[PDB]
């Protein structure tokens, strides 16, 4: 026999549904989710890391001028300076005093710590999500992991579960994210090869091995001092290690629905929005036919205590005449109060717990195939802050017959009444004035 | 100097456009596409292949009953049969005649030819397309491959081409396709684990190595014969090799626009719909200034011959007084007739070819910066079937002054006229009747 239902996506919450086949005793299932991942799809676009310069050992030859040659490496700049007269440690270096010339070169490369430390960019797309559900009934506790796009079945002892696709598939990401060591950000990074100096994305590369760079930090070469040997050097300072101290607040603090992150693969867990549908193919060796089905009649329910509040703070007893021992099943057929236990015991009186966030509930309950009702009046608790949430639907609406709005029909009927003598005493002379 | 244009997406077709800068001579470019791919994005969901059964060697022990054990493998079924008395080759097997018992088991696994022969499912999404364009002008023949999403530049000798994104990005695919060996189909396959026996998708698996199956073919075990040794066996026949003889017509025969397929990666080629935009960054060393620009005046164009038809079947001559030799450029500034050659020669008379699918064209043509007109009357060809297509826009509209509708103004003016004596001869007495 096959069935369909919907369950709310919120961790640690009971929900329950039926089958009522024909002939046989009823059967009540409960469904409860324990985990909910989420996963987008990525494709890399570039990386960045810190860099380092090199100034390899400038060249002097005296009374003979120069010429330097070009060569392939990113951001190579050579220069040529006339009229230099150094003065090294031992004495004066060489004496062809007026006509001396000197060259200089330097370049930029990646540092030695890039293959442990980098900050990469990415791009997002449509995403899929998977859940873990604990389902119990009959004589069996089981749990099951499942994809949520509507194609993946799974086998319990004879039964098939396939899940509805989604309510809606929005995500707490937009199209461009950037990931650096255990938290994800939300930037808008420059495209490629257009990083102006100083800010983020100053050194690019695709997949992190080698051979290709991009570097525009504005190298210029300056004139050396009067009577020394060094190489001067001028540069706007680096762009990576000026980002990781004056940064932002991360995305682990402005996530919308409690949606927590941890990422060697990027995820978003326990994210609590919406409904997930479920459908059911149920086997046949998990019912009871009629032989051990007890017959129960003249059911009468009362109440003794209630609060609102946030847990199982409503108690009720039951009265019934038995004929045979066994085990029946219980349910309340309305959305205003959910019960606690999944199977009452046999002969005598027995109690049931329930919770309801309303002033005056009324519903109909049925331990086995006979039905009954019982209603109550309620009062608020004296507290303000709890540590554990939400064990009711959250519907606080008035009933059709309460102390509160039994006042309502008297006033509306009362105001409905006094026009009624007014309407006809108009008319009773309205005929006679056509004499 | 920068420029923008649009070109029609149809293989083997000429199109041409200008720049007219200032001061310099004009310049005419032509653009022509030779190939057009298309490519969607995929993600695998399951596969299927043929299967095979195994019946490993049933067990007898006599005057001692049985018990078989369960074990983990897909679709394992064991049985137990009482009162069997076999009779093997040599004589009677064993003699504990009344109390004998016998067991049987069998299972299902994948065959030996799955890693050369399978049929997988997939899913489609948004797609991107790339083209190959031959562009020529000046003194240069070149071709260039290019992405069509508006981000990818490309370098000729100094110039930059970037292409407009798309007209629209529909595809000849819907969201679920299934691929088997060189042609793609269009099915609607069951989700996962819900394949009822006999039809497609009877054995599933994700990525094709091992360890996980799904199999529901309805194995049952039957009673062995009276006095033999075999294992009976009953099964609805396989689902894969009942699909590949009674199949469908494939998608290589109902593709919409001539869109042909071949697929180790899935593609769709030469697919002829729509327009693709183009923009232009043009260098400066590919013009002529004025020094070798000849001066041409008193241009006069006539005509001698035309057909409609499907190729270059209109010829015209040109007359002009020269002052210096060289090479000028030609163009017709309307959408009713496209020319053939890209640069006329210098001094004398010269001819130009053109094509036009209309009864009586009129347009304005300009070998260099002076302009002229020439019109003609035409007649249909005597043929019905050609082997090569479409060398005109395809606009067959009437002109503003033809033999055909010079008849039109006389009738409309004639009917416009005879009301005009009627209107005033009304009025001329309409005053005098207010005497």
From TrEMBL, chains A, B:
Cystine links in this protein are 49-114, 62-94, 63-96, 68-78, 259-271, 301-374, 306-378, 328-368
Localization, UniProt? Host cell membrane; Host cytoplasm; Virion membrane
**Which residues are listed as membrane-spanning?**
411-434
Its quaternary organisation is:
The precursor of protein E3/E2 and E1 form a heterodimer shortly after synthesis.
The identity of this protein, by name, is Structural polyprotein
Organism per entry: Mayaro virus
Covered residues of the complete protein?
Answer: 807 to 1241 of 1242
């Amino acid at each position: 026999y096959e069935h369909t239902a919907v369950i709310p996506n919120q961790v640690g919450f009971p929900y329950k549904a039926h089958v009522a086949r024909e002939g046989y005793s009823p059967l009540t299932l409960q469904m409860q989710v324990v985990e909910t991942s989420l996963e987008p799809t990525l494709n890399l676009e570039y990386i960045t890391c810190d860099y380092k310069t090199k100034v390899p050992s400038p060249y002097v030859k005296c009374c003979g001028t120069a010429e330097c040659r070009t060569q392939d490496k990113p951001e190579y700049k050579c220069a040529v300076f006339t009229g230099v007269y150094p003065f090294m440690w031992g004495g004066a270096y060489c004496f062809c005093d007026s006509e001396n010339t000197q060259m200089s070169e330097a370049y930029v490369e990646r540092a030695d710590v890039c293959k442990h430390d980098y900050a990469a960019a990415y791009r997002a797309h449509t995403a899929s999500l998977r859940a873990k559900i604990k389902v119990t009934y009959g004589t069996v506790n089981q749990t099951v992991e499942a994809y949520v796009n509507g194609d993946h079945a799974v086998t319990l002892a004879g039964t098939k579960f396939i899940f509805g696709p989604v309510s809606t598939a929005w995500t707490p990401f937009d199209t461009k994210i950037v990931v650096y060591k255990g938290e994800v950000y939300n930037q808008d990074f420059p495209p490629y090869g257009a990083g102006q100096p100083g800010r983020f994305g100053d050194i690019q590369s695709r997949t992190l091995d080698s051979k290709d760079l991009y570097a525009n930090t504005g190298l210029k070469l300056a004139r050396p001092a009067a009577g020394n040997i060094h190489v001067p050097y001028t540069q706007t300072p680096s762009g990576f290690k000026t980002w990781q101290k004056d940064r932002d607040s991360p995305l682990n603090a402005k996530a919308p629905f409690g949606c927590t992150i941890q990422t060697n693969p990027v995820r978003a867990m326990n994210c609590a929005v919406g409904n997930i549908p479920v459908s059911m193919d149920i086997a046949d060796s998990a019912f009871t036919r009629l032989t051990d089905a007890p017959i129960i009649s003249e059911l009468l329910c009362t109440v003794s205590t209630c609060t609102h509040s946030s847990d199982f703070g409503g108690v009720a007893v039951l009265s019934y005449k038995v004929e045979k021992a066994g085990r029946c099943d219980v349910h309340s057929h309305s959305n205003v109060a959910v019960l606690q236990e999944v199977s009452i015991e046999a002969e005598g009186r027995s109690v049931i717990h329930f919770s309801t966030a309303s002033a005056a509930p009324s519903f109909i309950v049925s331990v086995c195939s006979s039905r009954a009702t019982c209603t109550a009046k309620c009062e608020p608790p004296k507290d303000h802050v709890v540590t554990y949430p939400a064990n009711h639907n959250g519907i606080t609406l008035p009933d059709l017959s309460s102390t509160a709005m039994t006042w309502a029909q008297h006033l509306a009927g009362g105001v409905g009444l006094l026009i009624a003598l007014a309407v006809l005493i108009l008319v009773i002379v309205t005929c006679i004035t056509l004499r």
